Amino acid sequence: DSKLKDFGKTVPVGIDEENGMIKVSFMLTAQFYEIKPTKENEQYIGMLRQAVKNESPVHIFLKPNSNEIGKVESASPEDVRYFKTILTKEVKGQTNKLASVIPDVATLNSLFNQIKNQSCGTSTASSPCITFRYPVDGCYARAHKMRQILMNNGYDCEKQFVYGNLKASTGTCCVAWSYHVAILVSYKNASGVTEKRIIDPSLFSSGPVTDTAWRNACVNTSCGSASVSSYANTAGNVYYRSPSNSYLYDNNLINTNCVLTKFSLLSGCSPSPAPDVSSCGF
Known part of the structure; x- marks a missing residue:
């Protein structure tokens, strides 16, 4: 939405729980992002966990002026195809x-x-x-x-x-x-x-x-x-x-x-x- 900052699509590559916080890492960027393990966030966290497992893309929305994830949405099939092409097992x-x-x-x-x-x-x-x-x-x-x-x-x-x-x-x-x-x-x-x-x-x-x-x-x-x-x-x-x-x-x-x-x-x-x-x- 407009209240949240659109981070765009990315592929999460790590997830762990530290100090009551879920810490998420994404492809390319070296920065950590965080999300609180609340009941409200349980599905966003699950989407992230599955995306890390499968190296699949999601759409990230951030709380403004922060590294905190406010919303996670599914990626399109076009997204999935696109990310599979650039993040590849093909060695060149x-x-x-x-x-x-x-x-x-x-x-x-x-x-x-x-x-x-x-x-x-x-x-x-x-x-x-x-x-x-x-x-x-x-x-x-x-x-x-x-x-x-x-x-x-x-x-x-x-x-x-x-x-x-x-x-x-x-x-x-x-x-x-x-x-x-x-x-x-x-x-x-x-x-x-x-x-x-x-x-x-x-x-x-x-x-x-x-x-x-x-x-x-x-x-x-x-x-x-x-x-x-x-x-x-x-x-x-x-x-x-x-x-x-x-x-x-x-x-x-x-x-x-x-x-x-x-x-x-x-x-x-x-x-x-x-x-x-x-x-x-x-």
């Missing part, structure tokens, strides 16, 4: 050939610098800049844009998706996430042995870090309760991976650039929830 490899392994640490560091130079809030960056300074949401777009920079240099990489009750701190404020993603880059060390590091300037400004260290930064207990439930490594071209191992792609960065543009001026841990990006297509 990267078409143009690139080197999957960076030749040395010096080149890894060069790549890190090129990526960090594209941060929103730096004079070196070109539009759309990468919105590292806005950790609330958009990890998926930041990671895909980071990958593009590697590809501009003739390299590909992996993604690592980590999932759970995640919390991270900028040093001055906290965000909560249902998942996070960054690029996982393979490079040859001094002895020619392949090692991997995450690059993620939204969490580590200094340089590439181990994935172990990066996942730890996603469970920052100074922010509240946090834990990891899973992680998965994927091909770099995967834009988003669901907890059911379905893939979403963004091969022309249509979605990536749209999201980065939408968040371009945002910084810190507000606004939360992040602005609507449902209009960004693929």
Whole structure:
């Protein structure tokens, strides 16, 4: 209805009960949404539970200015068909050939610098800049844009998706996430042995870090309760991976650039929830 905020259609991917609240996660967005387990909400909650089970879409209405779900409606058959097409079990490899392994640490560091130079809030960056300074949401777009920079240099990489009750701190404020993603880059060390590091300037400004260290930064207990439930490594071209191992792609960065543009001026841990990006297509 008009009193509720239309979030649009999405596929819920997780549901749990924490502190008398039902916490729901959705595809692509890293934000949690909540719904109170009241008698009035029992059917909405059931619709969500079944949709999580089956990875099927629903239509979400939010209480205004909040992450609280006020209503859940069924998705159309056109919706079901549409979501099955974009959130797929069809695996599509990267078409143009690139080197999957960076030749040395010096080149890894060069790549890190090129990526960090594209941060929103730096004079070196070109539009759309990468919105590292806005950790609330958009990890998926930041990671895909980071990958593009590697590809501009003739390299590909992996993604690592980590999932759970995640919390991270900028040093001055906290965000909560249902998942996070960054690029996982393979490079040859001094002895020619392949090692991997995450690059993620939204969490580590200094340089590439181990994935172990990066996942730890996603469970920052100074922010509240946090834990990891899973992680998965994927091909770099995967834009988003669901907890059911379905893939979403963004091969022309249509979605990536749209999201980065939408968040371009945002910084810190507000606004939360992040602005609507449902209009960004693929």
